[PDB]
C-alpha cells in the first residue's frame, strides 16, 4: 500500500522547480529553503514521513557522477496546494571549512538545491522509507522532537492533522489526539515555518503544544545554551507519561547526536517507576511506535 521506489537512480523522474523560497528570516544563521517541484507528467506518489532522492549534476573530485542525496519530504501527500500535483523539500545549505578544505566548503547537492531557479529540471527518485510513517489512528498521540531541518517530516504530519484544506481532503483522518512538537534551532529567525506552526497552536490549543529550544536566546537551568535535550529533561515526567499510552508514537529527526540526551532524560523518568527505558524503548521500536531519522 505504501508507495516505494516508483522512480530509481537509473531512470529518475524529471521534475520542474515551481518555487524556491527562503525559510530563514533576516538575522538568522545559514540558509534553509522551501522548494516545490511539479510532478505532472509522472506517477510519483508518496505519503507523510517519507523521503525522496535528488541527483545533483556534475562529477565529484574523482570525476565520477554525483550520487543521490536523500531529503525528507516536506509536503503532505497532496502537496502544499492540496492538488496532488507537487512535492516539496526543506533544504539547508551545508557549509563548513578548514577541517576538510581551504576554508568555507559548500555541500554539492544542498548548494545546488538552495540556489535552484524556478523552471529548472531536477532528477528525483523514490519515494523511500517506512520508518517515519504516521499512524492512521485519529486518536493517537504524536510526540515530535526535531532539530533544524528535522522539522521536515513533522510539517507533513502537522499539515495533514491541522490544515483546513487537508481536513477537507481527508475525510477518514480528522485528528483529535494530542501532538507535541519540541523544536530546536539557534535563533527565532531560524524557526522554520514559525508563522504556520504558531497559527496551528492558536487554532488547536488542546490538540497541539509547541515548545521551542532557541540556543542563542535561552539558557538551561545549568547556564548553558538551550537545546532540545534540555526541554525534554524539563518535561521528562510528562513525556514519559504520554509515551506509556499504547497509542502514543514518538518521532525524532534532525542531525545525529540528539538521541543521547533525549534517552538520558526519559531514562531517569522511567526509572522512578522501576522501568528501564532502554528496554521499554526497544519494545516500542519493535512495535513501530518509536521512529528515528537522524543524519
Ligand atoms: C533520511 C535522510 C533525510 C534527510 N533529510 C534532509 C532534509 O529534509 N533536509 C536537509 O537539508 N537535509 C537532509 N538530509 C541530509 C542530506 O541528504 C544531504 O546529506 C545534505 O543535504 C548534504 O548533502 P550535500 O550534497 O549538500 O553535501 P556533500 O557535498 O556530500 O557534503 C557532505 C560531505 O562533506 C562532509 N561534511 C559535512 N558536514 C561537515 C562538517 N561540519 N565538517 C566537516 N565535514 C563535513 C562529509 O564527508 C559529508 O559526507 C537527509 C539525510 C538523510 C539520510
Concise summary:
With about 300 residues, the protein is α/β, with parallel strands linked by helices.
If you had to describe this structure to a student in words, what would you say it looks like?
It is built from 8 helices and 13 strands. It has helices at residues 108-114, 151-162, 164-169, 194-203, 228-234, 236-243, 259-271, 277-286; strands at residues 13-22, 32-38, 51-55, 69-72, 86-92, 95-96, 105-106, 121-128, 141-147, 179-185, 208-214, 248-254, 290-294. By secondary structure, it is an alpha/beta fold. Strands 4-3-8-1-2-5 form a 6-stranded antiparallel β-sheet, with helices on one face. The chain has a 5-stranded parallel β-sheet with strand order 11-10-9-12-13, sandwiched between helices. A two-stranded antiparallel ribbon has the order 6-7. The longest helix has 13 residues, at 259-271. The chain has 2 domains: 1-128, Beta Barrel (Elongation Factor Tu (Ef-tu), domain 3); 129-295, Nucleotide-binding domain of ferredoxin-NADP reductase (FNR) module (Rossmann fold, 3-Layer(aba) Sandwich), CATH 3.40.50. α5 (228-234) runs parallel beside α7 (259-271) and α6 crosses α7 (259-271). Bound molecules: flavin-adenine dinucleotide (FAD).
SSE succession:
EEEEEEEHEEHHEHEHHEHHE
Small molecules (ligands, ions, cofactors) in the structure:
flavin-adenine dinucleotide
CATH homologous superfamily designation of the largest domain = Nucleotide-binding domain of ferredoxin-NADP reductase (FNR) module
> Count of DSSP E strands?
13
Question: In percent, how much strand structure appears in the residues?
Answer: 25-35%
Described by strand count, sense and barrel closure, the largest sheet is: 6 strands, antiparallel
Enzyme class: oxidoreductase
Subcellular location: Cellular thylakoid membrane
Catalytic activity: 2 reduced [2Fe-2S]-[ferredoxin] + NADP(+) + H(+) = 2 oxidized [2Fe-2S]-[ferredoxin] + NADPH
EC number: 1.18.1.2
Amino acid at each position: 500500500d505504501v508507495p516505494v521506489n516508483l522512480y530509481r537512480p537509473n531512470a529518475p523522474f524529471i521534475g520542474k522547480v515551481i518555487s524556491n523560497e527562503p525559510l530563514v528570516k533576516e538575522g538568522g544563521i545559514g540558509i534553509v529553503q522551501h522548494i516545490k517541484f511539479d510532478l505532472t507528467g509522472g506517477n510519483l506518489k508518496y505519503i507523510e514521513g517519507q523521503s525522496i532522492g535528488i541527483i545533483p549534476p556534475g562529477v565529484d573530485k574523482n570525476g565520477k557522477p554525483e550520487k543521490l542525496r536523500l531529503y525528507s519530504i516536506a509536503s503532505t501527500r497532496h502537496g502544499d496546494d492540496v492538488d496532488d500535483k507537487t512535492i516539496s523539500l526543506c533544504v539547508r545549505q551545508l557549509e563548513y571549512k578548514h577541517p576538510e578544505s581551504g576554508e568555507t566548503v559548500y555541500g554539492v547537492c544542498s548548494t545546488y538545491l538552495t540556489h535552484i531557479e524556478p523552471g529548472s529540471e531536477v532528477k528525483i527518485t523514490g519515494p523511500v522509507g517506512k520508518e517515519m510513517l504516521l499512524p492512521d489512528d485519529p486518536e493517537a498521540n504524536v510526540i515530535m522532537l526535531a532539530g533544524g531541518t528535522g522539522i521536515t517530516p513533522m510539517r507533513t504530519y502537522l499539515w495533514r492533522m491541522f490544515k483546513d484544506a487537508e481536513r477537507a481532503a481527508n475525510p477518514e483522518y480528522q485528528f483529535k489526539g494530542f501532538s507535541w512538537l519540541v523544536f530546536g534551532v539557534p535563533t527565532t529567525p531560524n524557526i522554520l515555518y514559525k508563522e504556520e506552526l504558531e497559527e496551528i497552536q492558536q487554532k488547536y490549543p488542546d490538540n497541539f503544544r509547541l515548545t521551542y529550544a532557541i540556543s542563542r536566546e535561552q539558557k538551561n537551568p545549568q547556564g548553558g545554551r538551550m537545546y532540545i535535550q534540555d526541554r525534554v529533561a524539563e518535561h521528562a515526567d510528562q513525556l514519559w507519561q504520554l509515551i506509556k499510552n499504547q497509542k502514543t508514537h514518538t518521532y525524532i529527526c534532525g542531525l545525529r547526536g540528539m538521541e543521547e540526551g533525549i534517552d538520558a532524560a526519559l531514562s531517569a523518568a522511567a526509572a522512578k517507576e522501576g522501568v528501564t527505558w532502554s528496554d521499554y524503548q526497544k519494545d516500542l521500536k519493535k512495535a513501530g511506535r518509536w521512529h528515528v531519522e537522524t543524519y
